[PDB]
Amino acid sequence: SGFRKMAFPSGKVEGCMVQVTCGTTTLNGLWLDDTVYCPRHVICTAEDMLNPNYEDLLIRKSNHSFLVQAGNVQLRVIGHSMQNCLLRLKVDTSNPKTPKYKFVRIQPGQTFSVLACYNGSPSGVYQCAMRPNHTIKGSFLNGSCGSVGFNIDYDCVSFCYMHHMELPTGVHAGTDLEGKFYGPFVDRQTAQAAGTDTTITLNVLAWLYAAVINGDRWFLNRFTTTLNDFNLVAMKYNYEPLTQDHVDILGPLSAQTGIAVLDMCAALKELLQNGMNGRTILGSTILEDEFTPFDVVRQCSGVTFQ
Amino acid sequence: SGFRKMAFPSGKVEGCMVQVTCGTTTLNGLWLDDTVYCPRHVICTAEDMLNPNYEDLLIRKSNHSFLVQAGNVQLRVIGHSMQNCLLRLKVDTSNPKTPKYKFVRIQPGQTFSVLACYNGSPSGVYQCAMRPNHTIKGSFLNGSCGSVGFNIDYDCVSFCYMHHMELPTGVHAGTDLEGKFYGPFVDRQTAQAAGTDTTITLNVLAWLYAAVINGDRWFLNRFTTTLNDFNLVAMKYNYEPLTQDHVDILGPLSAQTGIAVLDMCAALKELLQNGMNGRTILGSTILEDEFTPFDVVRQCSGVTFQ
Ligand SMILES: *[C@@H](CC(=O)C1CC1)[C@H](C[C@@H]1CCNC1=O)NC(=O)[C@H](CC(C)C)NC(=O)[C@@H](NC(=O)OCc1ccccc1)[C@@H](C)OC(C)(C)C
Ligand SMILES: *[C@@H](CC(=O)C1CC1)[C@H](C[C@@H]1CCNC1=O)NC(=O)[C@H](CC(C)C)NC(=O)[C@@H](NC(=O)OCc1ccccc1)[C@@H](C)OC(C)(C)C
């Protein structure tokens, strides 16, 4: 049946994207009810980006220093304030397309869909995992700030990321919708680097369960392992240590496939030690770590192909 | 800056998805203006699926044999007809969310976004390439028929695929929006198999150009090749032969990077013969073939990182 990195349908979010301009700096904003949220660096000219004092830069602006465009319609700002690294612009019109929503701060290892936008116009959508080192491997160019990440449950959009910057290694950093950065990053152009990353063990196990649900068992073996012995191997291959909470989370997948978690761990230990021997799992020649246990349950059949 | 398999924002398509029921069989349909399009097998009970005579099955139905639901609203069908493998149901209401659109028959090697749907409700979106053997590697479960594939240009949606079936290897087959299948497949449950597939050479070259635009040149070499000598290597590695039309298509990417197409082919020949030596290109340990030259231009910067 297939397994793909699948994003949530983006319609409910497309109707919330607008363009925000301050002076000659322009980026995207998120319009919910009567507020527009956007990265605070929209108040910077290129020369202010190295060491901006945002409090000092913002006090010098008025409501009319901001131009907000929703399609071809201008939205008048009637208030503004700074919340951590975002600006909250109160506008005169409430967005009629506002979906049911909430703001959530996602945890490392969790995934979400990103709606890449430029000039307030959505251009593409893809799924990202929040890496253990708090960056995402996205695809963003100049003008993409203010693009958001989100998950959808029933018809409720949980926004969890707003885009602010790229680091030297080509990876990306940003904030939750309260303006607090994920990671130790700051919205300034002083030198910064992503810390060392690690493979998301829980997700790799979830994806091996997805491969068994879809009919493949070639990588299993007759062995088992203790949590500790598995972690000695994880440390060597730069995998996050497995915890009892992770074993408990994998309970439903384990039940649907009849494979004990520690037995699946013994399969993973053997794949780490011996390689894949030129074989593939769910079409991949490497161990995938950007699918959570929830992503597997969302996408795979609830009936294993025995 | 990143490179991801990026789908088009799905909002314009979500507003067109509805549910279609005939008897106890239910699948998704596409509602544009006053017509609903859906796979014709919606008229089959499970026992009719092995060898249905659709003309005979359909003449036995009336307009009220069909129940069409758009959200919580029932749409009355006032006409119906069969067009190849689809049914066209005329309904009493014109879809107010109909986007500007056209129907296109995509060619092998080209890509599109799929909006997976169940019970008329969109559940996920991802990018697919039409394989040389006319199948796609999607992710579809029971109830997903009628889901569509599309590309968006400006604000025009070009629909190009409607989903009908899965083959033994886990891959998928369907039709264009005139109901004609891509490939030699038929919408019946008699044994069928996907023919042998091939790697899409043009796309692999495009993706190597994307890697150079994004700043990486490790895989280049000082050699060149003729089209013929390259094709002798392509035949051995089950790659499609490169043609002069393919070289011409790669002209803009070649100009943006200053790398002649046949010199990039010489780089590809060396990667095929020697492997990647434990290295990655755009994060991948294998040669990716699901990005077209158009997909690279759409997503990468128009300025190479020299
Ligand atoms: C969004 C901004 C906008 O859309 C409009 C201007 C307001 C972008 C997104 C980047 C662009 C390329 N890909 C992206 O994701 N934001 C920014 O330009 C950032 C602005 C700050 C004011 C927050 N800057 C970067 O993303 C910047 N990063 C950076 O300076 O990091 C710290 C640092 C590391 C090493 C050496 C010096 C500083 C990027 C542009 O610069 C490179 C050189 C690191 C890629
Ligand atoms: C959509 C149908 C609907 O959503 C509602 C019922 C009307 C599905 C989608 C499949 C389900 C699993 N993944 C998918 O993409 N369509 C169908 O069920 C197909 C119906 C025909 C009437 C067109 N059947 C298949 O997709 C069927 N394929 C098939 O029979 O192929 C030919 C064949 C090959 C080998 C041996 C015998 C026949 C699938 C269900 O069967 C398996 C066994 C090949 C997966």
Side-chain angles (χ1 to χ4, degrees):
Chain A
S1 239
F3 202 69
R4 278 276 197 189
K5 230 150 216 164
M6 196 167 315
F8 282 103
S10 64
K12 291 171 173 65
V13 177
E14 296 169 45
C16 302
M17 303 305 308
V18 298
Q19 185 184 72
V20 183
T21 301
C22 183
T24 185
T25 299
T26 293
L27 42 61
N28 305 278
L30 183 68
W31 179 28
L32 299 170
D33 296 319
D34 67 347
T35 298
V36 172
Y37 300 80
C38 72
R40 66 185 178 168
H41 71 257
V42 68
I43 74 181
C44 300
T45 59
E47 299 70 34
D48 296 312
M49 296 179 177
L50 172 60
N51 188 197
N53 177 290
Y54 290 98
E55 179 184 358
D56 198 69
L57 291 175
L58 184 62
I59 191 80
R60 302 172 191 264
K61 306 288 176 191
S62 64
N63 293 329
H64 60 274
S65 291
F66 300 97
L67 181 190
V68 182
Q69 181 157 317
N72 63 81
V73 177
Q74 303 299 300
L75 290 59
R76 187 170 69 101
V77 356
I78 60 174
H80 63 277
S81 63
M82 179 163 63
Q83 178 180 198
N84 297 306
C85 300
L86 299 179
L87 294 188
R88 295 167 60 122
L89 307 178
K90 178 176 184 182
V91 287
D92 68 334
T93 310
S94 169
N95 184 355
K97 304 190 176 72
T98 309
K100 185 168 320 167
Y101 76 88
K102 51 202 191 186
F103 290 167
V104 174
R105 183 166 178 85
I106 218 74
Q107 294 278 86
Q110 302 190 295
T111 55
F112 54 96
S113 302
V114 167
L115 179 66
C117 296
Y118 294 86
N119 301 304
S121 179
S123 55
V125 65
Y126 55 86
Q127 193 76 169
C128 275
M130 175 55 67
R131 303 300 313 170
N133 71 358
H134 316 286
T135 62
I136 59 181
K137 297 179 181 171
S139 177
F140 290 115
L141 303 175
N142 287 168
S144 64
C145 294
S147 291
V148 300
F150 57 96
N151 279 287
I152 297 177
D153 176 50
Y154 302 130
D155 271 352
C156 183
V157 179
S158 289
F159 292 101
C160 60
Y161 176 86
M162 178 163 270
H163 187 51
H164 297 236
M165 62 192 298
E166 187 167 286
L167 292 166
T169 49
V171 297
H172 298 108
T175 69
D176 61 22
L177 266 297
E178 284 190 337
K180 167 181 182 54
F181 262 86
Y182 282 108
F185 311 110
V186 292
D187 53 344
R188 270 170 191 65
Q189 298 194 150
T190 180
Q192 299 173 67
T196 54
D197 201 26
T198 314
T199 295
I200 304 156
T201 305
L202 175 62
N203 290 1
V204 176
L205 292 168
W207 172 83
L208 293 175
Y209 277 110
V212 176
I213 285 168
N214 281 195
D216 202 356
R217 295 174 60 98
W218 76 261
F219 50 81
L220 299 182
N221 59 37
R222 65 170 175 105
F223 301 111
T224 193
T225 183
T226 55
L227 249 198
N228 280 298
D229 287 338
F230 175 82
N231 286 337
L232 289 174
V233 179
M235 264 200 306
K236 170 166 50 195
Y237 289 95
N238 190 34
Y239 266 54
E240 290 187 310
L242 197 56
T243 64
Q244 181 64 43
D245 286 359
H246 290 168
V247 171
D248 294 341
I249 286 175
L250 289 168
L253 276 42
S254 179
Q256 191 181 318
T257 57
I259 302 172
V261 178
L262 291 180
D263 297 340
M264 184 68 86
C265 289
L268 202 198
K269 177 190 293 169
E270 188 171 86
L271 289 165
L272 288 176
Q273 291 171 334
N274 298 355
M276 235 176 270
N277 321 84
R279 309 192 65 157
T280 54
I281 296 180
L282 283 175
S284 181
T285 56
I286 57 156
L287 302 170
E288 243 320 303
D289 80 343
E290 293 208 1
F291 294 96
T292 65
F294 173 91
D295 295 345
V296 172
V297 176
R298 173 188 163 208
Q299 180 180 170
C300 290
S301 172
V303 178
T304 69
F305 181 19
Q306 292 187 66
Chain B
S1 239
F3 202 69
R4 278 276 197 189
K5 230 150 216 164
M6 196 167 315
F8 282 103
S10 64
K12 291 171 173 65
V13 177
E14 296 169 45
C16 302
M17 303 305 308
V18 298
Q19 185 184 72
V20 183
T21 301
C22 183
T24 185
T25 299
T26 293
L27 42 61
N28 305 278
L30 183 68
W31 179 28
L32 299 170
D33 296 319
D34 67 347
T35 298
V36 172
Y37 300 80
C38 72
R40 66 185 178 168
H41 71 257
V42 68
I43 74 181
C44 300
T45 59
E47 299 70 34
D48 296 312
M49 296 179 177
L50 172 60
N51 188 197
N53 177 290
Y54 290 98
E55 179 184 358
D56 198 69
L57 291 175
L58 184 62
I59 191 80
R60 302 172 191 264
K61 306 288 176 191
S62 64
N63 293 329
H64 60 274
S65 291
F66 300 97
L67 181 190
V68 182
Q69 181 157 317
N72 63 81
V73 177
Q74 303 299 300
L75 290 59
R76 187 170 69 101
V77 356
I78 60 174
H80 63 277
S81 63
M82 179 163 63
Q83 178 180 198
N84 297 306
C85 300
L86 299 179
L87 294 188
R88 295 167 60 122
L89 307 178
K90 178 176 184 182
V91 287
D92 68 334
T93 310
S94 169
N95 184 355
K97 304 190 176 72
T98 309
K100 185 168 320 167
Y101 76 88
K102 51 202 191 186
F103 290 167
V104 174
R105 183 166 178 85
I106 218 74
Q107 294 278 86
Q110 302 190 295
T111 55
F112 54 96
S113 302
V114 167
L115 179 66
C117 296
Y118 294 86
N119 301 304
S121 179
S123 55
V125 65
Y126 55 86
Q127 193 76 169
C128 275
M130 175 55 67
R131 303 300 313 170
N133 71 358
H134 316 286
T135 62
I136 59 181
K137 297 179 181 171
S139 177
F140 290 115
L141 303 175
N142 287 168
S144 64
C145 294
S147 291
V148 300
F150 57 96
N151 279 287
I152 297 177
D153 176 50
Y154 302 130
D155 271 352
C156 183
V157 179
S158 289
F159 292 101
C160 60
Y161 176 86
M162 178 163 270
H163 187 51
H164 297 236
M165 62 192 298
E166 187 167 286
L167 292 166
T169 49
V171 297
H172 298 108
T175 69
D176 61 22
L177 266 297
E178 284 190 337
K180 167 181 182 54
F181 262 86
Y182 282 108
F185 311 110
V186 292
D187 53 344
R188 270 170 191 65
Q189 298 194 150
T190 180
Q192 299 173 67
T196 54
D197 201 26
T198 314
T199 295
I200 304 156
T201 305
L202 175 62
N203 290 1
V204 176
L205 292 168
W207 172 83
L208 293 175
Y209 277 110
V212 176
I213 285 168
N214 281 195
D216 202 356
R217 295 174 60 98
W218 76 261
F219 50 81
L220 299 182
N221 59 37
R222 65 170 175 105
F223 301 111
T224 193
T225 183
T226 55
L227 249 198
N228 280 298
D229 287 338
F230 175 82
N231 286 337
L232 289 174
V233 179
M235 264 200 306
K236 170 166 50 195
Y237 289 95
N238 190 34
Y239 266 54
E240 290 187 310
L242 197 56
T243 64
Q244 181 64 43
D245 286 359
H246 290 168
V247 171
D248 294 341
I249 286 175
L250 289 168
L253 276 42
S254 179
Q256 191 181 318
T257 57
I259 302 172
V261 178
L262 291 180
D263 297 340
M264 184 68 86
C265 289
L268 202 198
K269 177 190 293 169
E270 188 171 86
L271 289 165
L272 288 176
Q273 291 171 334
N274 298 355
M276 235 176 270
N277 321 84
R279 309 192 65 157
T280 54
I281 296 180
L282 283 175
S284 181
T285 56
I286 57 156
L287 302 170
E288 243 320 303
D289 80 343
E290 293 208 1
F291 294 96
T292 65
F294 173 91
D295 295 345
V296 172
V297 176
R298 173 188 163 208
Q299 180 180 170
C300 290
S301 172
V303 178
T304 69
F305 181 19
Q306 292 187 66

